[PDB]
Amino acid sequence: SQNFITSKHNIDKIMTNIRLNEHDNIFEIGSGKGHFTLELVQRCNFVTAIEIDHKLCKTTENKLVDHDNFQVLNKDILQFKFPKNQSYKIFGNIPYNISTDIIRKIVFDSIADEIYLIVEYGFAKRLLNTKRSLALFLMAEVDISILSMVPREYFHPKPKVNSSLIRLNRKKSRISHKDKQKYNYFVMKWVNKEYKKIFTKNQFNNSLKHAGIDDLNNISFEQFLSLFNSYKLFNK
Numbered sequence: 001s002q003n004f005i006t007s008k009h010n011i012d013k014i015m016t017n018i019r020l021n022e023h024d025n026i027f028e029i030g031s032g033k034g035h036f037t038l039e040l041v042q043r044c045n046f047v048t049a050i051e052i053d054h055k056l057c058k059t060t061e062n063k064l065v066d067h068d069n070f071q072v073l074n075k076d077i078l079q080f081k082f083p084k085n086q087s088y089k090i091f092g093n094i095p096y097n098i099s100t101d102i103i104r105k106i107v108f109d110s111i112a113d114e115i116y117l118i119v120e121y122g123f124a125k126r127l128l129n130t131k132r133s134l135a136l137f138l139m140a141e142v143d144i145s146i147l148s149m150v151p152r153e154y155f156h157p158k159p160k161v162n163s164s165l166i167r168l169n170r171k172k173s174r175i176s177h178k179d180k181q182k183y184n185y186f187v188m189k190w191v192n193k194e195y196k197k198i199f200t201k202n203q204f205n206n207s208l209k210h211a212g213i214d215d216l217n218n219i220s221f222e223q224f225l226s227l228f229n230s231y232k233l234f235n236k
Ligand SMILES: Nc1ncnc2c1ncn2[C@@H]1O[C@H](C[C@@H](N)CC[C@H](N)C(=O)O)[C@@H](O)[C@H]1O
Pocket: 002, 003, 004, 005, 006, 029, 030, 031, 032, 033, 034, 035, 036, 037, 050, 051, 052, 053, 056, 075, 076, 077, 078, 093, 094, 095, 098
């Protein structure tokens, strides 16, 4: 059930959009046959490949024979403990079934200042959709941008849908550690339209007009923050 991108011609097309340089240390999520890995090692300063499947760790190693700036840890990305005092970036052509868990792991339990992932086209659209809780929790920590479309033919087994190469850039968190829970509760209550649990009937009108929200079915992350902030004001 794991797919791969093994056409160099295609890999180069995708590297074209990935701006990683010679001095960055990179953590790749799932080396697979080592195709993207082979390019990263040449492209970057050092690559720590994290592959769960042990046979693939081997293949990754055979692939990277004429190279030294890498290591292949046979671990589970979800259980990995990233450095807490180093500057590193992340890349990964990750599986659909655990996209949410991986992205959450690397954005909340890692300090990579720049993350490059390939995910399903739809799932990418969702990461930017202010109507879903994931996008909202994520936008407090990173800026999300879709760089290009990865045709399903580039993959094998050929999936039923296309994919997108996306980029997550770290930013000074917009949500203080103090507001950790308030923001969480508020995000969940708002996405579920359970407005009354977070705003009285008037607090809600003022908050929307204050944030300048005309279409309540289409709001910017910046507007949403306004809402959250008003929310804080109203409750001590
Ligand atoms: N939980 C996990 N932790 C670490 N690696 C995983 C996990 N789940 C899947 N993988 C690996 O991640 C890879 C997913 C592939 N789509 C990418 C392989 C390869 N980089 C390629 O795109 O050509 C496979 O090699 C899986 O074995």
